[PDB]
Design a binder for this molecule. Structure first.
Ligand SMILES: *C[C@@](*)(O)[C@H](CCCNC(N)=[NH2+])NC(=O)[C@H](Cc1ccccc1)NC(=O)[C@H](N)Cc1ccccc1
Ligand SMILES: OC[C@H]1O[C@@H](O)[C@H](O)[C@@H](O)[C@@H]1O
Ligand SMILES: *[C@@H]1O[C@@H](C)[C@@H](O)[C@@H](O)[C@@H]1O
Ligand SMILES: [Ca+2]
Lengths: 249, 201, 94
């Protein structure tokens, strides 16, 4: 996260940390005790799917205070329409092998209905994005969870920054003055929108041209397009093999 | 090409009565308007209308010093990855709303002096279930210019006031006509109102 | 004065300008001529139909709640039915 602030311990309770071989990979969003939403591109290069780990209730990576809960990722589900090395359909649904326990420091973000997200949440100006990613473009990652308030754009207003590159499965958020943005390592993290006392999942940190670069915005995966797809899969019975390309729509 | 984007978005605003106007007349499509401040949520108005206008008064009077942006969505008729839209110019009500035509409330004469009182024009800014006056909103920012003359006046004379009354000197036996103009000297655009209807002794 | 047409509807008040007019409307009305009723607009596209969470048409007007919440008697509010409902932050809530 560039130009943000440390998220106070417990105030971003749905934030997930994904590790591979103990190494920092990406962020993610808990939406119930079993299921986590992340970015598809985070998994382009996994060699050993058995060493894939999700950590909840995390805050400081350099310390262990006892609120952390680790779970093995039993399944990574990705839209069949997603193509590794490209931007479109950058979303993944992760099944934890065992559910996490909900606590003051571990709580799911709500997955909204499509209509509600399209009609109401889409027009809430600001939303929070968070992660342990780079503090600057091509800089070092953060040890403490970082958070950032960013404004949302409809795509005609983003069109100039990314001509013919923003699909209906994306949206832009951030600042063209090059001061605040999500960044490498924040992928899969929530873009979370508050409405009437409750927080909802509206976006996923996906991609951008640099980080907080003048004249450009962060690009986020438009979660509203995947509500139906996500809910159908949360009902499907588990299958052998960690990775799974599920048809979209 | 199920819809066409609106265009020539224009703010029509007088005493804070603020209407957004656009083209074209709807063909097989309907419009929805949104308005916001630079950092506020979007508020929708005039849902699925076939009008080429939208009254946004109740939104802008909430804070007339804020700078507002509106946008008109085009929806295909009967079929209500986003809809086409167009952005309005930015609009700051306190600085841009047209001062309405003033009106002379009264004028009294005694001796070689005359009072000319301007009616305190009420605006569309509601507060406590009542409409605030033009001077309630602008205070010292607002002045009035009095034009006054007689049948034999080679030219109109001018007076000015920080309030709503003029106290001028006149010739004993002569009848004068009057006309007032509302001015906000600090403005850069729409600095002056139109002239008031003329009242004569 | 162009107000002689009495364009301002619904108990509105007309005020004459140079070559037009403006309508002062009652609190329940807006529009150039006070023609719009502010009450007759209970739809999901308009302020979420007054629902706290989910809304539905076609004609809220049927509000609903996310899992872990239930709809209250007012027919618009949602209340948690579990200890750790989604989208709420315990450390602040307390
Ligand atoms: C995977 C995530 O950690 C990371 C988040 C980047 C968010 N950036 C801003 N400014 N908010 N995403 C990436 O690193 C992607 C990876 C990628 C995705 C699709 C295709 C190829 C690579 N890379 C970027 O975001 C860079 N801007 C590079 C880039 C890739 C693709 C298109 C345009 C730029
Ligand atoms: O627009 C409606 C019309 O109604 C009548 C008024 O006198 C006109 O001035 C006005 O244009
Ligand atoms: C003019 O103003 C409107 C708002 C109403 O109060 C009318 O009764 C009045 O004459
Ligand atoms: Ca830790």
């Amino acid at each position: 996260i560039v130009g943000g602030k440390v998220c106070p311990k417990g105030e971003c309770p749905w934030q997930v940390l994904l590790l591979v071989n103990g190494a920092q990979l990406c962020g993610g969003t808990l939406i119930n005790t079993i299921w986590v939403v992340s970015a598809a591109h985070c998994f382009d290069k996994i060699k050993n799917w058995r060493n894939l780990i999700a950590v909840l209730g995390e805050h400081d990576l350099s310390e262990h205070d006892g609120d952390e809960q680790s779970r093995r990722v039993a399944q990574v589900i990705i839209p069949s329409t997603y193509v590794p090395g490209t931007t479109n359909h950058d979303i993944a649904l992760l099944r934890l092998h065992q559910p996490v326990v909900l606590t003051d420091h571990v709580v799911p973000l709500c997955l909204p209905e499509r209509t509600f997200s399209e009609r109401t949440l889409a027009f809430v100006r600001f939303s929070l994005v968070s992660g342990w990613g780079q503090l600057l473009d091509r800089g070092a990652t953060a040890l403490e969870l970082m958070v950032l308030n960013v404004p949302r754009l409809m795509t005609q207003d983003c069109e100039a920054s990314y001509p013919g590159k923003i699909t209906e499965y994306m949206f832009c958020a951030g600042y063209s003055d090059g001061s605040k943005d999500s960044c490498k390592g924040d992928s899969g993290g929530p873009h979370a929108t508050h409405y009437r006392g409750t927080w909802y999942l509206t976006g996923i940190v996906s991609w951008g041209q640099g980080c907080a670069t003048v004249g450009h915005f962060g690009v986020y995966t438009r979660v509203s397009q995947y509500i139906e797809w996500l809910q159908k899969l949360m009902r499907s019975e588990p299958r052998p093999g960690v990775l799974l390309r599920a048809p979209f729509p | 090409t199920n819809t066409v984007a609106a265009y020539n978005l224009t703010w029509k605003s007088t005493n804070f009565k603020t209407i957004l106007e656009w083209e074209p007349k709807p063909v097989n499509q309907v419009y929805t308007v949104q308005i916001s401040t630079k950092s506020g949520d979007w508020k929708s108005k005039c849902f699925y209308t076939t009008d080429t206008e939208c009254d946004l008064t109740d939104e802008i009077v909430k804070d007339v010093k804020q700078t507002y942006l509106a946008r008109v969505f085009s929806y295909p008729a009967g079929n209500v990855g986003e809809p086409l839209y167009e952005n309005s110019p930015e609009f700051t009500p306190y600085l841009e709303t047209n001062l309405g035509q003033p009106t002379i409330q009264s004028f009294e004469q005694v001796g070689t002096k005359v009072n000319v009182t301007v009616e305190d024009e009420r605006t569309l800014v509601r507060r406590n279930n009542t409409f605030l006056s033009l001077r309630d909103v602008f205070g010292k920012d607002l002045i009035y210019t009095l034009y006054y003359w007689k049948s034999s006046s080679s030219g109109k004379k001018t007076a000015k006031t920080n309030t709503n009354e003029f106290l001028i000197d006149v010739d004993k036996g002569e009848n004068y006509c009057f006309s007032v103009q509302a001015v906000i000297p600090s403005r850069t655009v729409n600095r002056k109102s139109t002239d008031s209807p003329v009242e004569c002794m | 004065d162009q107000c002689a047409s009495s364009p301002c509807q619904n108990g509105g008040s007309c005020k004459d300008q140079l070559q037009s007019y403006i309508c002062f409307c009652l609190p329940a009305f807006e529009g150039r001529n006070c023609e719009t009723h502010k009450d007759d607009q209970l739809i999901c596209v308009n302020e979420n139909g007054g629902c706290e969470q989910y809304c539905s048409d076609h004609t809220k007007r049927s509000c609903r709640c996310h899992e872990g919440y239930s709809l209250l008697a007012d027919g618009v509010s949602c209340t948690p039915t579990v200890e750790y409902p989604c989208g709420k932050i315990p450390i602040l809530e307390k």
